[PDB]
Symmetry: D2
Subunit: 294 residues, 4 copies
């Protein structure tokens, strides 16, 4: 391995081009993003065989300073004319490889920094503020992009993934976990009605990478919509396990978005202990990792 880069490149932009013209689904009222306030946390990694001597000899001649990568990202958020974090990453990646010919590969991660609307009274009525926003520490959208320079100096995207991270959902009833193996290592009682509490990280990949950019917004899959599918399916389902639940969420996602190739889940179990009153469990947490494919 041989890479270097910059992490935690925060950048906040006001009045990005709004996202509109999206295609709706029954589970979600989502109809676009105002983009009055747009924040992203970017990580950039770069590689290339010409970087070897920066390690083996301490030769910095071909080293783009990581501070300069930070400047690069922040400047490009100012000039970005698109509507999605996915499109922003492509803009940065393409621009970076065009600028720095000795770099052979670039990886980017972008995490939304979410803000929520607030309300204010003005001119006699209470309404959504166009000025004041609440920083949210709950779920957030993510995007990943990897781009390579080929021998002929053409650029190719080699991997793209979008996601939703930090979703924490508890369903107070209508969940069971029974029928599991009962042997000499088992002390967990069967439970026909538990308040299942899951952490969900959901990632999806498009059949066609272009659909991720938002340039034809009707083909874009919004994290907001994925969130609403997850909550609806959780509500609808008499769950038999977390495994059972996330398969069903995945199937619904792929049904609602035929342009997707696959969905990947990372879930954690944080269900409370019963002492109706419950309390926090000991630290160990179950987890599940599962891919659903078209």
């Amino acid at each position: 391995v041989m890479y270097y880069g910059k992490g935690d490149v925060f950048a906040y932009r006001t009045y990005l081009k709004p996202l509109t013209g999206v295609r709706t689904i029954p589970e979600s009222p989502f109809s676009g993003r105002d983009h009055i306030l747009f924040g992203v946390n970017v990580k950039i990694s770069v590689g290339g065989t010409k970087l070897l001597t920066s390690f083996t000899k301490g030769d910095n001649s071909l080293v783009v300073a990581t501070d300069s990568m930070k400047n690069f990202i922040q400047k490009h958020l100012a000039s970005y004319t698109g509507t999605t974090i996915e499109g922003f990453l492509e803009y940065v990646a393409t621009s970076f490889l065009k600028k720095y010919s000795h770099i052979e590969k670039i990886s980017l991660i972008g995490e939304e920094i979410p803000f929520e609307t607030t309300f204010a009274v003005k001119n006699g009525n209470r309404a959504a503020s166009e000025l004041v926003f609440k920083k949210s520490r709950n779920e957030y959208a993510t995007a990943y992009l990897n781009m390579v320079r080929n021998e002929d100096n053409t650029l190719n995207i080699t991997e793209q993934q979008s996601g939703l991270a930090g979703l924490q959902l508890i369903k107070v009833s209508g969940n069971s976990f029974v029928g599991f193996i009962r042997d000499e290592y088992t002390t967990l009682p069967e439970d026909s009605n538990r308040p299942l509490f899951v952490y969900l990280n959901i990632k999806w990949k498009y059949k066609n990478t272009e659909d991720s950019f938002g340039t034809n917004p009707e083909n874009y899959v919004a994290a907001e919509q994925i969130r609403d599918i997850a909550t609806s399916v959780f509500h609808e389902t008499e769950t038999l396990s977390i495994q059972h639940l996330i398969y069903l969420i995945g199937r619904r996602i792929l049904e609602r978005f035929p342009q997707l190739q696959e969905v990947y889940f990372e879930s954690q179990n944080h269900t409370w202990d019963k002492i109706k009153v419950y309390t926090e469990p000991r630290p160990p947490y179950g987890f599940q990792c599962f891919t659903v494919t078209q």
Copy 2:
């Protein structure tokens, strides 16, 4: 000082008596709490001169185990018939001092563990779920109560305070900070239009402690309403400083809620640096502490 107790006593209760019959204000649509899911994090501290030898001699005869305090709190959440965290603390405090005659003082802190509603499609339409909730890591209500046993075994509340913690608000324009002292220690440029980003912790005290319990809900002051006042005032105000803003929020709170005696602010400045694009500042943060009284 001589106290001991238990912290991080999480307790989650389903179907607490709903809070309704509240008195509305223009800034807030708040009309009550469903209490399908009610979570609280309690810290309990107890004192009394009869605890001395548990320190000086290692004599545990009069020691209520802190583990037993945790059991006490969780059991009382199960039996609580009221509608507010403030009332829960009074219930716990009175009960504890009645049980344990050698304890002279008890302090309680209760922090709301907030959950947000989610949507689900059932029977043809999308509607708020009565089963699935989203755990929120954003702002949360707080309550504080101290109670003492007098010589005649009567119990008195000696301090009560309610609050709202973890409110993080950014206003993208309509904020200035100019005219401050410019001397040999000053490098901060004057700024006629900054995206002021404040953390707010707001605490209020009632003229009549009975009003905090929710037994006559029309006299209760809800953290939700306080939150909505803060966002409204922030929006309305061409801020001149954080100091200026929190005084105005305080004045409005006291105007809307004549039954309050005072409001106390702890604010922090987390305003982004301009590189329109902004980024995270260095770690040092400004803060302000201010009390507004009727």
Copy 3:
């Protein structure tokens, strides 16, 4: 309440004047600090009736910018000729009140950012490096100072306190907790031999505040010595409770340091659950608070 200021003012200084000539005690090898690297996290709070209109009118005329306070602290670390965090706080406080006549009160907290020595080899001989240090996230020294301007314009230290924070000690055997109250709320079994795990925060006050500055190092009480006293007493004692333990630690501190007036403890219980193998408990933690006086 009416204060404002700056928190998380990190400042790192190289080659501070070394602390030397400290009176040693049996429990500790500590004799001083080389101060090749000296890190502090400072919080400054200031008050004064002349600050009122900065809140009530948005008048910034007598506002020292919190950014400027940060500059003030960092510039004074560069000029500081003393040898302790306690002395540094006094230097900053006195200087600030001398500079800004409209300020009546200043409160300072200083937390050590600790660094540990590392090994390097020269001529086949391994010894402590004078260049490379390890940043520690374990225990750290603290200092507190409050200074006020009197009506006759004299300056007075109204409160001073030193401390040790973040000490986490586990004793694998030789600890009991038995004989506590057993009633309807008690589920905790008696334990004649538990691996007591305590978090300790220890704070001391001097009879004479001048002794805290270290200008006469024979009278200075180092956090390192307090640490070594705590571990020695823990080792020596068949503990009967945390309450029992911290009283004995306090007595030993006051015996070793007659120049101290009091020692104040804040302890927490994080003892593992037994399944010899143990595991982490549920989140609730016991705590104790106790002052021992000379």
Copy 4:
């Protein structure tokens, strides 16, 4: 992907068999581990085609409860007769695959929970305590193991890696970063003498995975020794970049330990800003990733 398991399985064992007979090197005083206290944080992931219906049909028949996996790990720590985290992972993995024939693959991560020795005095003499230990939140050893069941029912380790995580080192002088690319995105000044502050995560792989277990202790590579090599090389080197430094650390490690096949570095740059006094930078951090092979 199709896996599930348990994370944050903390387990603390007293009086594990001591690690003895480790070959000492000039950079380090390390000669073994007393293992009076032995703490590990384990993550277990398992897979197999037969787990499919637990996802697709909600069939729990072949589900080992994640709670049971926790029980399995903790019971095996109790019976483990070896001397290393690496060996413990092998013990758990082999045991688990022997028990559960429907499981085709198991991945294990083990992270040391480190404790440090403390001092105690008896009859006027200070020595290391055999009873009281200090929990450390600084650097810690890691181990990774992946094991699979083949078609002929033999078991095979497919991946093994050891490591040192959480090392934070600052060298106060003797570091430069100059000669990097200066173009339209470069604002970083060259620095001929910076107080380079690096976070290091170092991982190594053995030529023979058997050497990782410690059964032949002369071939075991201790994380403590890797730490002391890293600090020695940092001290000795006039660093030209972090890239330059980690290459040299890697080369020294492979020189000292011919039984190793590779060393992999993940570093981060956290160097302070100069205001001699320095302060914390803005959040963005540089990072470097490099593999040195034998």
